[PDB]
Design a protein around this ligand. Structure first.
Ligand SMILES: [Cl-]
Ligand SMILES: [Cl-]
Ligand SMILES: [Cl-]
Lengths: 116, 116, 116, 116
């Protein structure tokens, strides 16, 4: 798992389950290329997005569909989505966890990078 | 003053000074239209971005150039920027403050909406 | 004004209004001695806790009664309070702003330190 | 485990390793009873603090010795230690992860609470 995304709900104190996540990589021409996507599990985790070979140095974007999440819980949110854009592997290979904590008016995101 | 941005550096314990901020509004196009921009002052605040007459209902994106801020201090941060996408004024006009807290591997962004 | 506290509610996108804040200073017997207290205003801000004369070097604790706040809004909170413990004035007098972002299962507290 | 603590470093974007963590439970004589302690692992995680049988309803404090952690990394921090205080098991038994992200001037803490 070179790349893992974790999503948490700060209103209920729970993993955010069945949240849609899209990942893109910036391509040579400044456009965003589709790279991976999925839905978070019961633990709020999305694994199996990429291989060590496919996950090269670059700029990556993680788009989180927060609005559908809230609406499915009966909340009409102010935040439309979250977009986290980061540089990877520029110092050589690392495992990355992109975590996001959601509220209807806020998010926080953290990156944890560890060396294999 | 309908839109303000306030930015704090949580690792150095200081306002984040001279940080570039861009604001976009979603067009019927579905395209992000440039709307306003400026730099944070010595207190980490950016006022005067827009006027009541220009800040109509819609979907807005605030992008804070955190990468340039950290690089100017010598630091290679994780993220290219901090951002928030929100719906504005859709139940009458409000004052919006976007509050951002920054570290090199994490950020939070919060929309604070008042009357007053 | 050497110590200020600013409190934001990240779930409702509002200042946290009428929240009790208590400040302690560690005494020479390692007990937390009561030092100052107040309630946040309509803007989420608490000014006037202490004077330059009374705010000497030491270790201080700021405790924000987040439990009573969430309870008043009909929200079950996790924490009894949000807190920061910091060393103050240990190399010259500074102005300290404690910035707290709140949600029912998450908080952040940041010491913002600035000069004369 | 009914209780896990995870500690992260926001400056380095890494788990915070060999961080001292003490857990207390508020007693009837409203003193803090020592309850458990340990040091975070290489993943920043501290497991095995308690058992289901011992982890009764109550008010708990998680104290994190952030000062010694920063000092070992050659930083003399303004933040002295974190004290995360919460009610546990008051809606019946749950599993708790208390996560904290550290800077020399700030911290952010989240609780994830799940029902097994
Ligand atoms: Cl981002
Ligand atoms: Cl904060
Ligand atoms: Cl606490």
């Amino acid at each position: 798992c070179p790349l893992m995304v974790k999503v948490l709900d700060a209103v209920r104190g729970s993993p955010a389950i069945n949240v849609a996540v899209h990942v893109f990589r910036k391509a040579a021409d400044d456009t965003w290329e589709p790279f991976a996507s999925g839905k978070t599990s019961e633990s709020g985790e999305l694994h199996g997005l990429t291989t060590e070979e496919e996950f090269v140095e670059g700029i990556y974007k993680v788009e989180i569909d927060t609005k559908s999440y809230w609406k499915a819980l009966g909340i009409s949110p102010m935040h439309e989505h979250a977009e986290v854009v980061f540089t990877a592997n520029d110092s050589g290979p690392r495992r990355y966890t992109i975590a996001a904590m959601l509220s209807p008016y806020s998010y926080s995101t953290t990156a944890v990078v560890t060396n294999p």
